[PDB]
Design a protein around this ligand. Structure first.
Ligand code: HEM
Ligand SMILES: N[C@@H](Cc1c[nH]c2ccccc12)C(=O)O
Length: 343
């Protein structure tokens, strides 16, 4: 029934099916080498497939992203053992910059590379550690990524829909159904991911690396374009400094299309600012205004049903959390409160 997911899942599967460096059997050997902390071996394994003579001219986005994925697991691994990958692998940096050029993404692996663009089968899935907890971590993102992309499209569409129209309530109800997948992700994480194993065994693989004379953050679900959705939905005109910096920090890591969505809405009132201004002008005696606001409140409810438990999970891992999480939750409650007050 979440019919819009299909196309996004299909585009992900295209990258996941691609192995342009014929590296599948090679990357599967990485977990054992990480367990052994075998740095020379990690470099040697990478050199078995790293292009030395530039990128094949026939490659498009799909091949370049797939290549970045397979090289990428080596980047996080080398840094995990205390080494700048660019410093220990000659000729690596130019390849990373070429792949960045070909994908219009940063010159290292991102969330997309390690989750939705990473095949799912046991004989193919790339991993830093080979641990069950890592496999569960990747699955938690696959549960909701395509749904989130659909949700972004639905939010952009809703922005131009009048609150006076019955379409507003209907589109909002639809948006809520897609955002429920984020809740499913966190439920999944609670059930299957050890916060201790995350903190002690997985987290070390996601440190920043230096390429091209700047630092690039490691993969994380923090890179999910949920912040772009909410930029459009409520946050575009926020004067909260910490929040603004958070969005600008992760902007480079999302797909080009979402970076442009973000740019489009930055110089404008957010959806709810427009929605509430309309409600105050027309009045809540209009049934479609009442229904629209009610449906919009339910959208905030589902964001909070993701965000509140997520914070507890993050705090539990650190018990074995960064301040921006609690700050973002507070902003989200305030956003919902504005809708509640309008009614
Ligand atoms: C034990 C598992 C998890 C831990 C320990 C964790 C931890 C964190 C931390 C510490 C942050 C703040 C950013 C940072 O400093 O890295 C964060 C942000 C974020 N996380 Fe998680 N996380 C977990 C699971 C998940 C899952 C399953 C999802 C969704 C699939 C998710 C989605 C997000 C998003 C979208 C952000 C950006 C901030 C926000 O929207 O509130 N996380 N996470
Ligand atoms: N949200 C956390 C933990 C997390 C969830 N899914 C992930 C996938 C890859 C790396 C980290 C994660 C983070 O961004 O760090």
């Amino acid at each position: 029934t979440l019919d819009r997911v299909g196309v996004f899942a299909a585009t992900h599967a295209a990258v996941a099916a691609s192995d342009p460096l014929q590296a599948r059997a090679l990357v599967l050997q990485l977990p054992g080498l990480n367990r052994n902390k075998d740095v020379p071996g990690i470099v040697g394994l990478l050199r078995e497939f790293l292009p030395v003579r530039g990128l094949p001219s026939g490659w498009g986005f799909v091949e370049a992203a797939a290549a970045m994925r397979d090289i990428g697991f080596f980047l996080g691994s080398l840094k995990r053992h205390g080494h700048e990958p660019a410093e220990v692998v000659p000729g690596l940096e130019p390849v990373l910059l070429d792949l960045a050029r070909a994908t219009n993404l940063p010159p290292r692996e991102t969330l997309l590379h390690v989750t939705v663009w990473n095949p799912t089968a046991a004989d193919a899935q790339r991993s830093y550690t080979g641990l069950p907890d890592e496999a569960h971590l990747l699955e938690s993102v696959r549960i909701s990524m395509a749904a989130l992309e659909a949700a972004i499209a639905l939010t952009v569409e809703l922005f131009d829909v009048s609150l006076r129209s019955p379409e507003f309530a209907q589109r909002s109800d639809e948006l809520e159904a897609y955002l429920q997948k984020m809740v499913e992700s966190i439920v999944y994480a609670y059930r299957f991911i050890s916060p201790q194993v995350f903190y002690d065994e997985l987290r070390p693989f996601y440190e920043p690396i230096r390429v091209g004379g700047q630092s690039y953050l490691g993969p994380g679900a923090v890179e999910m374009p949920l912040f772009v959705l909410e930029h459009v939905l409520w946050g575009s005109q926020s004067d909260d400094q910490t929040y603004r910096e958070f969005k600008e920090t992760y902007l480079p890591y999302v797909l080009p299309a979402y970076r442009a969505v973000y740019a489009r809405f930055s110089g404008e009132p957010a959806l709810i600012d427009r929605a509430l201004d309309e409600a105050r002008a027309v009045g809540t005696r209009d049934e479609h205004v009442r229904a629209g606001l009610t449906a919009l409140e339910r959208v905030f409810k589902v964001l909070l049903r993701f965000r509140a438990p997520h914070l507890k999970l993050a705090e539990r891992a650190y018990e074995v959390a960064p301040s921006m999480l609690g700050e973002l939750l507070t902003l989200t409650y305030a956003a919902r409160s504005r809708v509640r007050a309008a009614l």
